[PDB]
Amino acid sequence: ALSLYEKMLHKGMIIKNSNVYEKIKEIDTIIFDKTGTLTYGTPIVTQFIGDSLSLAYAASVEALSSHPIAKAIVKYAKEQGVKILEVKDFKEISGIGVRGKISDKIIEVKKAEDIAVYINGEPIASFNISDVPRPNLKDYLEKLKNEGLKIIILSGDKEDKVKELSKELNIQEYYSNLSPEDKVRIIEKLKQNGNKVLMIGDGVNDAAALALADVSVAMGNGVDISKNVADIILVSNDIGTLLGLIKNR
DSSP, X not given: OXXXXXXXHXXXXXXXXXXXXXXXXXXXXXXXXXXXXXXXXXXXXXXEESOHHHHHHHHHHHTTOOOHHHHHHHHHXXXXXXXXXXXXXXXXXXXXXXXXXXXXXXXXXXXOOOEEEEETTEEXXXXXXXXXXXXXXXXXXXXXXXXXXXXXXXXXXXXXXXXXXXXXXXXXXXXXXXXXXXXXXXXXXXXXXXXXXXEEEOSXXXXXXXXXXXXXXXXXXXXXXXXXXXXXXXTTOOHHHHHHHHTOO
């Protein structure tokens, strides 16, 4: 008929080396790296404080970045109606901040305090940003009873945010404010403790954790340009189906 390999692609998953087909059979622990899996890979502005002119300055600078956070700020500014302006002496450092010069001012957009806007050293405005939760869940309650799989949520996000998403999906065990190395460190303790771990991630800030898991699943719409290392690629980015595959055991 078709090669196994051709069947799977037809259901929206790319398989590595077929050692995975026998390696799933035995997993008892399913781990979700929250960003891009339980949520879209796409942030949105939820609040802005300051005047319209500060808004424009901040959007003009973020327009030169390719970061998801930047993209979301330029999109929000355009929906309010402001237009993009001339920026000079641009300078970037991914996930920390960005700088540039307009009308002889120096403007800065950074975090570590969500986001703050600065004009000539003065902190004058701010942004508050979050991510959009996906739909489903049933496939969740399913696998909690099915095989009696344990289910864990990991994230680099703040404690109050991971908690709230945990209540809504009804998951007891979660960990917040994790670096990429912390994540590696959690997967280790589970393996030493005799657990068999399946983990699902988007590739950003977690390539090392995924390489460690007994079976790894990567998102397609996540720029896996160079995280092409995972046992399974959910090319469709339909999480239900994998949840469906784990259900057939």
